[model samples]
Target: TYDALRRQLIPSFDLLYGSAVSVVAMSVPATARILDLGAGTGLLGAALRERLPDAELLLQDRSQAMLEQARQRFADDDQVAIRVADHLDELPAGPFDAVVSALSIHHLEHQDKQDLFTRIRKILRPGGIFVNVEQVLAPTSELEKMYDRQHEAHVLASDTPAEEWAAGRERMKHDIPIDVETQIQWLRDAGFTTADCLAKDWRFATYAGWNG
Candidate 1:
C-alpha cells in the first residue's frame, strides 16, 4: 500500500512535503536534533540531513518497508536513524528541538490526530516547534466543490486523463474532512500554546505550535 501510495500520490507528496522541506530549510538552518514524523522515504529528513550535517535526525514511520526504503536512502550516513513508529503514541526518544510532519498525519483518524498532537507536545522541549504541512479540507461544501473543480482542472491538464480523474474522484468521495478551526481547537486542547494555521491555500494548510 505504501508503495502504491508512493507511486500514485507522487504529485500530492511533491506539492506537500516538498514545499514543507523547503520552507523549513529556509526557516531554520540553525535547527538541531530534528524528528520527522511519518518520514516515508525520508525525503523530509534527507533534505534536513544534507543541509545540516551536524544536526541529529530521527526518521519515523509505521511501515517497515517504508523505513527500509528510507534506510537505504541514508545508507551511507550515520547521522540519520530510521525507525518504525506510529505518530499517535509516545515516541521512544526524548524531547527534540524541532518536530516535523508533512503529508502524512491525515492518514490517522481524527481523534488520533488530536491525541498525537498532545503526545507530540509532551516530547517537545520548551520553545521547540511542531510543524505540520497537510492536505486539509475546505470549510464548507461550496468551498469543497471549488477545491474539487480546481483539482480536476489540474488533473485534466496534467495528463491524469478523464477516466483516471473520475476513478480518483470515486475513490475519494467519502473522505472525512475537518475544518482548520476545529483542528486548532484540538491542538490547544492538547496543551500547545499559540496554535495557529500558519498558512492555507484552499484545502491545504501549514500549521505551527510551540510547547512554551
Candidate 2:
C-alpha cells in the first residue's frame, strides 16, 4: 500500500463513492474516457476500474518511484493506464469525461492546487465531473492539534507500536494544512461550480464539485 493509501485508501474512497459507485459509474459510460490526477500507486483508478470495467482510466503521478510501484501493482490491470508526471504539466491529452483524485492533491502548494483545477477544467469534455477525495486543513490551530491528539489516541488504541505512533504523528506537520473554506475558495476561483466539502473528520475531508 502507498503510505497515504493506507490512511484514506479505503474509507475516503467509500465515502466519495456513495451509493456503490453509481454516481461515477453512471456518468462514466457517457464519457468512456477518464483521467485520475495525482493517482499515486493507482488506488483510485484500480478501484474505479473494478466497478466500471468498460471505462478507460488513466493514472497520473509525479514520482518515478511511485509510478513504478503503480505500474507493478497494476501490471495486469488492462483497464488502468499509468503516467508519471505533474498534475498540471504532464496530464495526458484528454477530452476526458471524468476526473478524480484521492488524497494526493494536498502535497502541492496552494497556487499550484488552484492552477491544476483550472487546467483540469479546460481538458474535460462538457458536463464532465471532477471529484476529489481530499485531506483538508482544520480551521484552527486548536482543532489541528486536537485532531493530532485524537489521532494519537486512535494510534495508541490500535496495535501499532508506541515508537511508530510517536514518530508518525511528529512528522505530520509537514503536510500543507489549510482550512476547508480556503480550499473551497481556491476551487471557486479556479472556475468550479458548487465547490464545497462533502465529508470531513477534523483534518481529513472528501470534497467535490463540477465545472461551472
Candidate 3:
C-alpha cells in the first residue's frame, strides 16, 4: 500500500529512482557492499537488487514494522540483512562500497542530516559513493509555493484518491526539506571529495557524493 501510494504520489518516481540506480551501477562493482539508510520496506533495495544481483545489501530503518516487511521481501536472499536504527544513531559498521537512502533523510533536522553525511563518509571506503533520493525545498519561498501548486496538480491529475492525497500531505508535515545547493555544499564540507545533485524534478532530487 505504501509502495503503491509512492508511485501515485511521485510523478517522477521512475526517473528519480532510475537515476539513483544507474549512478550506483556505474560507480560500484557488481559484487559491491551496499547500505540503504532509512531503507523502509526495501523499495530502493529491491531496485538495486534487480540491477546488481551479486551485490550484498544492508537495509537499515527506524521502524521495525517496516523492517519486518523488508525481511519478508528479501527472505530468500542470504546476501541481504536488515537493521533497526534511527538516522541520528550511530550507523552500522561499514567500509561499504556504496550507501543510499531514498525519500527518507529529509525527515532529519538539517544539522542531523549534515552530521549523518559526515558519518557516512567515515564508513565508506575510498571510491565509495553515497546516493540520496530526497524531497528538497526550492531555493526561495516563491518557487516553493510554485512547486507545491504544481505537485498537487500533478498528483491530482494522476487520479490519486482524495484520502490518500490528504494522508500524504499530513505525513509531509514532519518533513524538513533543505535546498539542494546547501545540501551539496554540506556534503563537500563533510569531506566528500565531490558532491553534486545528479537529477531533479521540482521538489524531488538525487544527490551523490564520492569518498576519495
- Alpha-carbon lDDT, every model: 0.72, 0.69, 0.92
Compute the lDDT of residue 31 as modeled in candidate 3.
97
Model 3 segments beyond 4 Å from truth?
Answer: none
Q: Which residue runs does candidate 2 get wrong by more than 4 Å?
A: 2-13, 16-23, 161-167
- Residue 11 lDDT in candidate 2: 37
Q: Which tens-of-lDDT digit does each residue in 1-212 have in candidate 1?
A: 23433334333545555555555564454647788999888877876676677777899998898888888888988778777877755685566877888667877789888888888887788777778877678878898889767665555556654575566668566555577788778878988777777666666677777677
Candidate 3 has an lDDT of: 0.92
Best by TM-score: 3
Better of 1 and 3 by lDDT: 3
C-alpha root-mean-square deviation, each candidate: 3.6, 3.1, 1.0
RMSD to native, candidate 2: 3.1
- Predicted candidate 3 versus true structure: per-residue lDDT over 66-162, tens digit per residue: 9998898999999998888998888988889999999899998898998999999989999899999999999999999998987898798888999
Candidate 3: residue pairs that collide: none
Off by over 4 Å in 1: 1-19, 22-31, 161-175
For residues 1-212, write the lDDT of model 2, one tens digit per residue.
45442542233345554422445675557337888888777767777777777788888888877778778877886777777788657567688888888767777788888888888888777667677777666677777778666655545555565666556556555666567788778777877766666676555666665674
- Position 145, candidate 2: lDDT: 78
Q: The CA-based lDDT of model 2 is what?
A: 0.69
TM-score of model number 1: 0.80
Superposition TM-score, candidate 2 onto the true structure: 0.83
lDDT of 3 at 171: 94
